[PDB]
Amino acid sequence: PRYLKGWLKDVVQLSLRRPSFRASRQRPIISLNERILEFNKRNITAIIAGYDRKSPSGLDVERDPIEYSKFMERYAVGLSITTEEKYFNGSYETLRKIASSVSIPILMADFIVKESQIDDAYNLGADTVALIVKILTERELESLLEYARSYGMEPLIKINDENDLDIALRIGARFIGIVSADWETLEINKENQRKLISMIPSNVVKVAAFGISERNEIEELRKLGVNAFSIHSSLMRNPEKIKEFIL
Numbered sequence: 001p002r003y004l005k006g007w008l009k010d011v012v013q014l015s016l017r018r019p020s021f022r023a024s025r026q027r028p029i030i031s032l033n034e035r036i037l038e039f040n041k042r043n044i045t046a047i048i049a050g051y052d053r054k055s056p057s058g059l060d061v062e063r064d065p066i067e068y069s070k071f072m073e074r075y076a077v078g079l080s081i082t083t084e085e086k087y088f089n090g091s092y093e094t095l096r097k098i099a100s101s102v103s104i105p106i107l108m109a110d111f112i113v114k115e116s117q118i119d120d121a122y123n124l125g126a127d128t129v130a131l132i133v134k135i136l137t138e139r140e141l142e143s144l145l146e147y148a149r150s151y152g153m154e155p156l157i158k159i160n161d162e163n164d165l166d167i168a169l170r171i172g173a174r175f176i177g178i179v180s181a182d183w184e185t186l187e188i189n190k191e192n193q194r195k196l197i198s199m200i201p202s203n204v205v206k207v208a209a210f211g212i213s214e215r216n217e218i219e220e221l222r223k224l225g226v227n228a229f230s231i232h233s234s235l236m237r238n239p240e241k242i243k244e245f246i247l
Helices: 006-016 032-041 065-072 092-099 116-124 138-150 162-170 193-199 215-223 233-237 241-245
Strands: 047-051 078-082 106-109 128-132 156-159 175-179 205-209 228-231
Touching: 032 078, 032 205, 047 065, 047 233, 047 241, 065 078, 065 092, 078 092, 092 106, 092 116, 106 116, 116 128, 116 138, 128 138, 138 162, 156 162, 162 193, 175 193, 193 205, 215 241, 228 233, 233 241
Parallel strands: 047 078, 047 228, 078 106, 106 128, 128 156, 156 175, 175 205, 205 228
Antiparallel strands: none
């Protein structure tokens, strides 16, 4: 990975050490990005509903992940399941249980820095993963992008500034997440958002991520060309808001 400091470095060191999970996938790949395109064509608001047991910024929601997913399965274009253990209280076994329980696309939300974690996602039933430009060298990015593609996954490339975007297009990303967060503190930061989204090629499926809590935010972003919306925290705290977000 790249030179890093603080909590982000720590989670990356953790992820480098993550042992591989023994499992055989009993479910086909259900393309998240293609299902986003079908929602777009059918005029249905595409929400990617996230499950986080905890977050490093102090989210702590006990909430059964199976019932949460089956509920979200009715309204969501896809699920985003965080499997990172230390800061998010996630697990591989939670993802496996949910993957057996739902027939919509699942993105494994973790800090991917090695091929083994892509084997894991695949073997556990995930349909895709995200790759973070801030933590990966462009050579690691290129390598992991091809590795995921060889499994039939189109990964979401997560960017949060103009340099990240330049790298994502260089590697030929077709599935981009615009993260409106400061990586150091995980405070919402929507300064770059509207200008980053305006730079993205129209043939790339764009996902807005982080700090989305209102339908107005979603509506404004749909007019700016955003294809889908990743929402974690607001939905963990109030699962019924999914019925508002798709209005």
